[PDB]
Amino acid sequence: VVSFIGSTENDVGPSQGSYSSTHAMDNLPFVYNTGYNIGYQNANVWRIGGGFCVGLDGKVDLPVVGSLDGQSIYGLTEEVGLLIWMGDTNYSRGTAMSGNSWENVFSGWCVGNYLSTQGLSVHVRPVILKRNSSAQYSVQKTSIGSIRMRPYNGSSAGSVQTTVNFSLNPFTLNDT
């Protein structure tokens, strides 16, 4: 048994967020290490039971303005980009992202003959692209991508909602 209990649209990171870094941005691109603060986590998006086996798929829509260490830097504005992560519940369980096609983000599992729940989590890292002349970057609310449950081992979804989508909450990058 499965069931959708979460929400279709989920905002990544809080609104009006301010971030700072005194590290080093000499040789762009630079990537703020804000940990997992800009993201989304709902360990309860699908209710499952009876051997139901589920995995997790993710897909970012933003264009690939490049690639950082085998990961795809996704762009928003001329000067701003991001390192995107998607996967299962525990933020630490994230799977970096490359391209704009559906990729496996969580190997999944097979619950027992009891009632549990299936979750997901997104986390992003703000990348600075092209130079500026104010040392300040704005970020307007923009779509990012989605996650879709992956029923396997003979498991079925049916008409039960399989995908939820994400959106990047606005914010601004500082540095000083």
Ligand X SMILES: CC(=O)N[C@@H]1[C@@H](O)[C@H](O)[C@@H](CO)O[C@H]1O
Quote the least distance from Cβ 15 to ligand X, whole Å: 25
Beta strands in the chain (DSSP E): 2-4, 9-12, 17-19, 30-31, 39-48, 53-60, 73-77, 80-87, 95-96, 103-110, 116-128, 137-139, 142-151, 163-168, 171-173
Identity of the residue, 33 or 114, whose beta carbon is nearer to ligand X in the bound complex: 114
Identity of the residue, 55 or 81, whose beta carbon is nearer to ligand X in the bound complex: 55
Cβ partners under 8 Å of residue 49, min gap 6 = 1, 2, 111, 113, 114, 115, 116
Residues forming the site for ligand X (CB under 6 A) = 43, 88-89, 109, 116-119
119 is in an annotated binding site: yes
Identity of the residue, 73 or 86, whose beta carbon is nearer to ligand X in the bound complex: 86
Q: What is the spatial distance between Cα 95 and Cα 122, in angstroms, rounded to a whole number?
A: 9
Identity of the residue, 116 or 165, whose beta carbon is nearer to ligand X in the bound complex: 116
Q: What is the spatial distance between Cα 160 and Cα 89, in angstroms, rounded to a whole number?
A: 20
Quote the least distance from Cβ 36 to ligand X, whole Å: 16
- The residue at minimum Cβ distance from ligand X is 119
Quote the least distance from Cβ 69 to ligand X, whole Å: 26
88 is in an annotated binding site: yes
Quote the least distance from Cβ 64 to ligand X, whole Å: 28
Identify whether the C-beta of residue 1 lies closer than 8 Å to the C-beta of residue 155.
Answer: no
Annotated binding site for a carbohydrate: 43-44, 88-89, 116-119
